[PDB]
Chain A
Amino acid sequence: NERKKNANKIKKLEKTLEYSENAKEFQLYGELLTANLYMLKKGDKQAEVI
């Protein structure tokens, strides 16, 4: 049990894990806005980026 049990629960961990990262996307762009922190409005959605 404990062998197969936790083998199952831990491949299950991995299975559930692979999906979401959602961090460096928008991290690098927060850095971009910090860089271009002089062309901004508080009232926009879009950006222009390099």
Chain B
Amino acid sequence: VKLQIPAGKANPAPPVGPALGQAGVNIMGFCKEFNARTADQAGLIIPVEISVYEDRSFTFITKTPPAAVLLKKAAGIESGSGEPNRNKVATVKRDKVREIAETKMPDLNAADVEAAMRMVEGTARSMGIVIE
């Protein structure tokens, strides 16, 4: 199961209390496991994949935050472009592309820096942002 939670928050029941209440875990127990491991900013957003074995042997990998989050913090948007290719509501740098690479080249999913950038910019145009 994929979760998407801030590094400092815990016990948001309605997100995962379903998602692993059929799995049946301590809501605050596992969310404070999460905060203990990612003892970092609340209000942040970590994607985190939980893998559960048949006997309920749960583990998980926390991962780098979304570029959506990083560039909401950069440009100052809440929603993306209401109409990308018609409205550009946010702007970043090539330097920001490299910052986000160096941030997330572990999580990035093309072996080259330039193909990593191709995918990153596929996402940048997904969310409708221009470059500086």
Which chain A residues have a beta carbon within 8 Å of chain B's beta carbons? Answer: 31-32, 34-38, 50
Chain B interface size, under 10 / 10 to 19 / 20 to 34 / 35 or more? under 10
A residues within 8 A CB of B22? 37-38
**Contact present for B13 and A34 (CB under 8 Å):** no
**Contact present for B14 and A36 (CB under 8 Å):** no
Q: How far is the CA of A31 from the CA of B13 in the complex (A)?
A: 10
Which chain B residues have a beta carbon within 8 Å of chain A's beta carbons? Answer: 13-14, 17-18, 21-22
CB pairs A–B below 8 angstroms (10 shown): A31-B14, A34-B14, A34-B18, A35-B14, A35-B17, A35-B18, A35-B21, A36-B18, A37-B22, A38-B18
**Contact present for A37 and B18 (CB under 8 Å):** yes
Q: Which residue of B lies closest to A50 (CB)?
A: B13
B residues within 8 A CB of A35? 13-14, 17-18, 21
A residues within 8 A CB of B18? 34-38
B residues within 8 A CB of A31? 14
Q: Which residue of A lies closest to B13 (CB)?
A: A35
Q: Which residue of B lies closest to A31 (CB)?
A: B14
A residues within 8 A CB of B14? 31-32, 34-35
Greatest chain B CB density within 10 A among A34, A35, A37, A38 is at A35
A residues within 8 A CB of B13? 35, 50
- List 14 extra interface pairs beyond A35-B13, A37-B22, CB under 8 A: A31-B14, A32-B14, A34-B14, A34-B18, A35-B14, A35-B17, A35-B21, A36-B17, A36-B18, A36-B21, A37-B18, A38-B18, A38-B21, A38-B22
